[PDB]
């Protein structure tokens, strides 16, 4: 009976 | 001095034979790319800006501008994956790759940054940046006696884009380079840096969403125990994926379930099934549902640990998603138990919760509710004790609900509904 179901980018800024 | 320059100049300075003006145009086309408010990344992609930018990544001769055009082909492929492919077909990948081995700390960590944000695409390019072998130079850099020695924004990143590479689906990282990033992972894993143990515990979660095979290369590499240690952290950004990750574990083998109790996750459940945040009280219930729906003694386990209440708790009042999991926890719960465990939980008052969810306006929490009225049902024929259940479920108004189920408008609803009135009322 099993039921299975932090950015991927990011800019650098000053 | 190279403030809010426009495209055009920065094209002009480009196009100049002289360094030290590419330099100054590049460092111009950083600081466009690198304001909040709308940077103009169509604007610098359509004027041909990407190849010369991924050029001066091989000068070695000259390291500031090394430096600005990672920066800016940083920030280019943190956009959409057009601009992120426009990167890619400049030929950054392997540019981006002997970046890595620079002298200067700054530069490569902004090829680990670049690197990162490719990876974090999707499966594809992901799978391109490790065909070109960032691996093997990746980890070189977190090869030190003691990971404290290391800047801390520097290790985030690097953190930060090894979880890139293990991140998506449709298909999961290659079966070898997640053998080859994982005893990193786990090292990471026991670090004391907050951000770098949620980055850690992701890069985890991700690698235990699929088949059991996929959480056996994780499990074997003993990280439950130190799963469940970051599970009663006081930070949430830690919590979270560790629960994610935990969560994922219990839906594998009864085997790999077990480890996960044996190494005391059950004891952080009150907490975890109270929590203030939304979430994380659903992702809790996720958990308890798949581990009812292991062995009797796991069954026996929650129980032991006084779950039950907690599940009747968050069945009485959670958010809907919630009680979703909760009303799973049951059916699973009383489809597996036995006898004695489902009796248990009638006398936890599981029913009148139970009988409430009925009116919910959701087909598929109605067919699972109808489900663990039925198992309890027939664990009250062994013991003749169906007319006392009955009445339980005439006394809070659960009768009224079944029988107006019998016009539902779903057909396994209504079968199951009228199944249940002519049977036992
Ligand atoms: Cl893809
Ligand atoms: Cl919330």
Known sequence: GKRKLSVPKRPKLP | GTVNWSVEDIVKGI?????ESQL???????????REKQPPIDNIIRAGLIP???????KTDCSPI???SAWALTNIASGTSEQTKAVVDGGAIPAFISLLASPHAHISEQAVWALGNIAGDGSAF???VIKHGAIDPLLALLAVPDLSTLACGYLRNLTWTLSNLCRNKNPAPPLDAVEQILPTLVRLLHH???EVLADSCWAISYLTDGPNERIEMVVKKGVVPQLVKLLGATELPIVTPALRAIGNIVTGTDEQTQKVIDAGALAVFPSLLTNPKTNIQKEATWTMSNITAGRQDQIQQVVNHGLVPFLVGVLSKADFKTQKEAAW????????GTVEQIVYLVHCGI???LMNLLSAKDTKIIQVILDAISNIFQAAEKLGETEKLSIMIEECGGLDKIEALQRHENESVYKASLNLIEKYF
């Open chain 2, 126 to 128: 992901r799978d391109l």
């Open chain 2, 351 to 353: 029913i009148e919760p």
């Open chain 2, 24 to 34: 100054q145009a590049t460092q111009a086309a950083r600081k466009l790319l690198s």
């Open chain 2, 15 to 19: 196009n100049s034979n002289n360094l």
């Open chain 2, 66 to 68: 090394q430096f600005e």
């Open chain 2, 192 to 194: 004391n840096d907050p």
């Open chain 2, 329 to 336: 926890a049951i059916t699973n719960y009383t489809s597996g």
């Open chain 2, 52 to 58: 010369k930018f991924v050029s001066f990544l091989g």
